[PDB]
Symmetry: C3
Subunit: 341 residues, 3 copies
């Protein structure tokens, strides 16, 4: 498959890991993810060096992952620390590949490429997720589509007007204002819906509304497939700087060429201590992302064979600039690698 391996990808949410290993495939690479006794997260190739058994099916012994087949034990670095057979020798050939991993902003980031090049400073900024001023809730979802389809989906938040009709439709959609900002390793799609009636969702954020209001749906894309949106609503002429909002985490990580992992979240500055508001945001993520965006994109993935078999290319609309620019940047990154090594 075609992937951009030299970049950080989210492999899991902190709460998904423990002393019991989690087996998950990232960029066609099977991984064994677990948290060691000292709390440090480890990510090993889920293939024992001996006979290829799944290390993820083993248990921790003295904080070391024990292969369930013949008992070899490994440390977080992939180093074999115990061989219960024969002279118990541990030659270098018994070490397993260990991947660079960094736990930051309540996310487990992994570098699937040359471990020597992993640069922590290149990890996208999702600080809001651990900011005490924000309330964050979210989850995980699996989708049977190429990750680029979801990136396209998120880079044109205008699809909410239809796919999420019941919760996001606005009567001022025809008055939308959009801008695209290209930076270094970052692209932004700004959108503002002026003087309209709050959508059913924004209304909930406002705990009941009717009077006109201004709403924004901006989104920031960072190298490969990590996005953070900005959904905000505020009366008439109230600047978005001081508006209530939700900074949404929308990060995709390729599983196989035709499937991907979707990590989503909401970091809001309103109704912080409201379990009901928590419910509103969780219901939306469940219906919108997992049970609406999934259907559209999975159906699109099923039609790929037909479109490719024939010479069908997509027809872009005025709302596609951002998505197209991001698509082109990912394509360039793919070409570089396919061309580098």
């Amino acid at each position: 498959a075609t992937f951009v391996r030299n970049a950080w990808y989210v492999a899991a949410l902190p709460e998904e890991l423990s002393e019991k290993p989690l087996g998950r495939t990232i960029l066609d690479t099977p991984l064994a993810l677990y948290r060691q006794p000292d709390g440090v997260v480890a990510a090993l190739l889920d293939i024992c060096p001996h006979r290829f058994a799944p290390l993820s099916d083993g248990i921790l012994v003295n904080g070391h992952l024990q292969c369930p087949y013949h008992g070899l034990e490994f440390d977080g670095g992939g180093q074999c620390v115990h061989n219960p057979h024969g002279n118990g020798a541990r030659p270098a050939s018994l070490n397993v590949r260990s991947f660079p991993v960094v736990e930051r902003d309540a996310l487990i980031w992994i570098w699937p490429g040359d471990p020597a090049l992993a640069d922590p400073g290149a990890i996208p900024d999702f600080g809001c997720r651990v900011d005490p001023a924000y309330r964050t809730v979210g989850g995980y979802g699996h989708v049977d589509c190429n990750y680029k389809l979801l990136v396209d989906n998120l880079m044109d938040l205008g699809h909410a007007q239809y796919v999420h009709r019941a919760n996001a439709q606005t009567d001022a959609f025809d008055r939308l204002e959009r801008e695209v900002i290209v930076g270094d390793g970052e692209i932004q799609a700004l959108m503002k819906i002026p003087g309209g009636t709050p959508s059913v969702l924004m209304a909930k954020f406002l705990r009941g509304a009717n009077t006109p209001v201004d709403a924004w749906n901006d989104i920031r894309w960072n190298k490969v497939s990590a996005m953070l949106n900005f959904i905000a609503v505020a009366p008439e002429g109230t600047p978005k700087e001081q508006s209530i909002h939700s900074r949404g985490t929308h990060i995709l990580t390729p599983e196989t060429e035709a499937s991907c992992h979707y990590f989503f979240g909401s970091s809001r500055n309103f109704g912080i201590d409201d379990p009901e508001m928590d419910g509103v945001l969780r219901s939306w993520q469940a219906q919108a992302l997992v049970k609406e965006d999934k259907v559209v994109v999975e159906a699109i993935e099923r039609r790929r064979a037909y479109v490719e078999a024939n010479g069908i290319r997509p027809a872009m609309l005025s709302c596609d600039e951002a998505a197209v620019r991001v698509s082109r940047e990912i394509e360039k990154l793919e070409q570089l690698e396919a061309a580098r090594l």
Copy 2:
């Protein structure tokens, strides 16, 4: 896959369609089938021109199918009639492919191939389905086998449907049409059929013919009559047995019964609307799907079928389909 695209195929029964689009694949082509406000059926490629979303998952807006993803709207011709974005321009690139479709004889016919060759006059004749003198009931069925296996099944020397349990032979070959005739004077095993028996009494003649039309549309004739009456004045049923390829290894099966007896009798409708009693008994379904699973082995090896005396009709039909395949493939 190998399909004969230049021909009319049944895509659905009238009752299956409404203002709520039906998504169905025909010859590996996904279609969005729906009936417009004026009652006219439309068939569009189920792939939005914008980003390929399934139009069949959308709803009608002002009689126009609205894509569920970003709202583009299309008319029955595939023409984009509304773009809610930006200047709302509608360049030709936003139109979606529309397929020739004709509703006739209580069937929805579609032409999946070269649209320039789509000629309504070439649509097989199933007039009995809408003939007030006949009572028609039927349904739809899905099978996991290549459509040719079911065509072979139906063309097989008068094996009839379970419900039809019971001069001589004659196989007339025409242009895109083949007829397999069978008259059974007096007969031995049994001439009067379980379902027809209730009619008349005195000695009779029996008939079991089937007509095949270009590709995979068949209409059979199951009948019985006393002494030696006219074939057309007999107690009979004309069965609709039409296959439409879905993928190379699966197909749609549209079946029906047009009978001239017990017209206003509901007991008979129920059994004639049964898939296993009228189209394929479970035992036979297990067999064609099992045959499809053995295709790889037979092809990998040089295994060819050994024909028996009962295969003439099936073989002739198979050869005609093969010729049609070659014609199309030859072009490109």
Copy 3:
């Protein structure tokens, strides 16, 4: 796929066959297996010569297998003996392929390759299965892995230490002494676990014993994938021969390139008339082979694509000599055949 067709493989256990045909695929070849009225087992290609229907879905008529589609009937030799259509002629083109089959040692052996080379004298010896001095119980299992993975598994009974720890664990495993015997078309791995307490299984063998014991785990491999192990346990310094033992039948037969049939059994010389002793062996078989072993190897099979895509080769340990020798012999046999056609 790559198979060694010129050799005898077990296609079924005697008890699995009757007048009701069994459809099973061996080396990617679908077969119809059944026992005729006179008790003789027949194996026909499960593809009717007429239109390819599954003969295995038919019934016997006058001892002849009747195709469920149009009624052609065949004898054990594959010869069409009845055509109910037209003049009822039976040309040679209506005969179906019949495979060499031999019922011996309570096993149904079939020859899937060149029929002119099938030699009954080449059938592996599993006489213990029909020896009145032994009590035999066993069964069948289907596994989604290449048969070679299970051959590797069995040629290193040491995995029992971890994969079956709850029932096979042993402390003396560290003082293990193993031998490797090579013979004409035969390889044996010897294992001796002297001085120590018996595992949960051995204790049941000795009907709850309370004495340090000497254990024995040997296994014999014969051409391709037929194995017979020797699990024994006896009061310390006791003649290994005169020990309480169970000769285990462990025979694999490839189904497809990534799946296989597993025939297992236990021929014991202790507790012959004990339905409960029968119960301990049956429970172990259910938990250890069909469950535990299955899980490990099916996971390994799923990782084959990754290991092949990359240049990953297995790292052998001191416990792999036997398995490696057997693997090399099978590879040679594969090369020979591929070298001919």
